[PDB]
Design a protein around this ligand. Structure first.
Ligand SMILES: *[C@@H]1O[C@H](CO)[C@@H](O)[C@H](O)[C@H]1NC(C)=O
Ligand SMILES: *[C@@H]1O[C@H](CO)[C@@H](O)[C@H](O)[C@H]1NC(C)=O
Ligand SMILES: *[C@@H]1O[C@H](CO)[C@@H](O)[C@H](O)[C@H]1NC(C)=O
Ligand SMILES: *[C@@H]1O[C@H](CO)[C@@H](O)[C@H](O)[C@H]1NC(C)=O
Ligand SMILES: *[C@@H]1O[C@H](CO)[C@@H](O)[C@H](O)[C@H]1NC(C)=O
Ligand SMILES: *[C@@H]1O[C@H](CO)[C@@H](O)[C@H](O)[C@H]1NC(C)=O
Lengths: 49, 196, 49, 166
């Protein structure tokens, strides 16, 4: 437990990367979090929005 | 009569496979240390789910009955084991108050603990553990059947040892998948400060 | 390199220019062995109408 | 119904199909084509439910009898059970990565050497380093001061008719 400083740098960067990745599964107010899914389901004009 | 649902009532909520990771999922689970209604006959409600269990010896418990009006007016599912096979039907029967039409569906194929979970279309989970008064401890439930019958249910009953009736609630848990993908332990994420 | 630097001369070094990316050669589709067929043989090849 | 009539009075058998759709999950669905299985190529798979692009390879993971997918610590698809023959395949996204252009100054020579980052250097005189796939530079056994840094301890330089050494 003396090496907390280095452990802290490693842990902080790991958590940043994991949050960045898990942002992929959010809708932000759109229909579906998958791109091809909206391209197939919704018409191009709606898919644009 | 009542008893205390210590730790039981956990079922693999989906089909994915995870190894040695602590997953955190929100769904309808049976709250830990809850109140189970000790029985040894009548109808019961179907609020949002059931934790039907049993500590049987000579298969006194045979089957279930579901449905809204519980007789001829709507359809009413019926699972039965008549010592041959589990003859499932969905025929809108005219029922008898002491047992022991269009059919949109059919099918024909103390030391026993047959834990079961039912919910809505219709899903079932089960687990058949040897036992020897509800034993503490932990055991997950594998999903053995799904039925796309679209029936509307609000009540149920039992055909004809003792059984118990939980009631699921929408509570977040914390599951411990082991390395084989087997749930080995869970933590009710709202039970008490330590658990939060 | 000359184009990304906006220059006609580049001093010695190592610059990053583009993004190597393999392309998906062919699509594939998989579904369980189709069985449990409908009994149309009983509707059309029935003895008596 | 007499057999010597014309086709006008001749009997006809009629079957009428009524496709009813109520708000139910549509149990009566048709067949689904299932192409052959190809491995070890960046392909665009669509298994029974899920889609995506990858490189399918025979794995050794042991699912449970009813499980279908596998996921990573970051909630990403990693293994799929072949719904026809129950063999569990992995999923490795086919390689991408940056492209760097090692060069002495244009004031010296027009020769360069490319470095594809993080590839097995068989997916594109051709050196394979711990950094990537170096293309266009001789591999010396010597060791001099680092002129152009690359990574993992490799350094390249323009030396003796001359060329680029790493
Ligand atoms: C419900 O649970 C409490 C404690 O959790 C217990 O004291 C009580 O007897 C149980 N039954 C009823 C009807 O309250
Ligand atoms: C159970 O019920 C089904 C449906 O009525 C019937 O076909 C079967 O013979 C029954 N089994 C026995 C042992 O009576
Ligand atoms: C089922 O019945 C309840 C009332 O008992 C009603 O609110 C609900 O809409 C019904 N659902 C279906 C699918 O019939
Ligand atoms: C996991 O599965 C293997 C397969 O036989 C079994 O031997 C082992 O006991 C299981 N549990 C653990 C913790 O490895
Ligand atoms: C660099 O360019 C200048 C022209 O501006 C030239 O006189 C000089 O010799 C060049 N040096 C080298 C090392 O190429
Ligand atoms: C590159 O691919 C070949 C053939 O697939 C393989 O034999 C070799 O081991 C690979 N290189 C590395 C570093 O894995």
């Amino acid at each position: 437990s003396a090496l907390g400083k280095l452990q802290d740098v490693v842990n902080q960067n790991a958590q940043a990367l994991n949050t960045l990745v898990k942002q992929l599964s959010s809708n932000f107010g759109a229909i579906s979090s998958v791109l091809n899914d909206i391209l197939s389901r919704l018409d191009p004009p709606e898919a644009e929005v | 009569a009542y008893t205390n649902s210590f730790t039981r009532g956990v079922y693999y909520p989906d089909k994915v496979f995870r190894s040695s990771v602590l997953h955190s999922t929100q769904d309808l689970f049976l709250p830990f240390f809850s109140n189970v209604t000790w029985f040894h006959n009548p109808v019961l409600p179907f609020n949002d789910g059931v934790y039907f269990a049993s500590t049987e010896k000579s298969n006194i418990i045979r089957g279930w009955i579901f449905g809204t009006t519980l007789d001829s007016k709507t359809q009413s599912l019926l699972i039965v084991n008549n010592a041959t096979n589990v003859v499932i039907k969905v025929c809108e029967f005219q029922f008898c108050n002491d047992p022991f039409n269009n059919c949109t569906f059919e099918y024909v194929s103390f030391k026993n603990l047959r834990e079961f979970v039912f919910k809505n279309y219709f899903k079932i989970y089960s687990k058949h553990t040897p036992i020897n008064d509800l034993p503490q401890g932990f055991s997950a439930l594998e999903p053995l059947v799904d039925l796309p019958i679209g029936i509307n249910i609000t009540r149920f009953q039992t055909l004809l040892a003792a059984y118990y009736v939980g009631y699921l609630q929408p509570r977040t848990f914390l599951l411990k998948y082991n390395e084989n993908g087997t749930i080995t332990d869970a933590v009710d994420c709202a039970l008490d400060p330590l658990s939060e | 390199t000359k184009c990304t630097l906006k220059s006609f001369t580049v001093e010695k070094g190592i610059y990053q220019t583009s993004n190597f990316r393999v392309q998906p050669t062919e699509s594939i589709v998989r579904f369980p062995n189709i069985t449990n067929l409908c009994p149309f043989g009983e509707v059309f090849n029935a003895t008596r109408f | 119904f007499q057999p010597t009539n014309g086709v006008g009075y001749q009997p006809y058998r009629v079957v009428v199909l009524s496709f009813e759709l109520l708000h139910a999950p549509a149990t009566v669905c048709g067949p689904k084509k299932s192409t052959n299985l190809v491995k070890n190529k960046c392909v665009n798979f669509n298994f029974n439910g899920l889609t995506g692009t990858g490189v399918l390879t025979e794995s050794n993971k042991k699912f449970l009898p009813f499980q279908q997918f596998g996921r990573d610590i970051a909630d990403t698809t990693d293994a799929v059970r072949d719904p026809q023959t129950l063999e569990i395949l992995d999923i490795t996204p086919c390689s991408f990565g940056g492209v760097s252009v090692i060069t002495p100054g244009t004031n010296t020579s027009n020769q360069v050497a490319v470095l594809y980052q993080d590839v097995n250097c068989t997916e594109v005189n051709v050196f394979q380093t711990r950094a990537g796939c170096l293309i266009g530079a001789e591999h010396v056994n010597n060791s001099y001061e680092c002129d152009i840094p690359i990574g993992a301890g490799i350094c390249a330089s323009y030396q003796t008719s001359q060329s680029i050494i790493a």
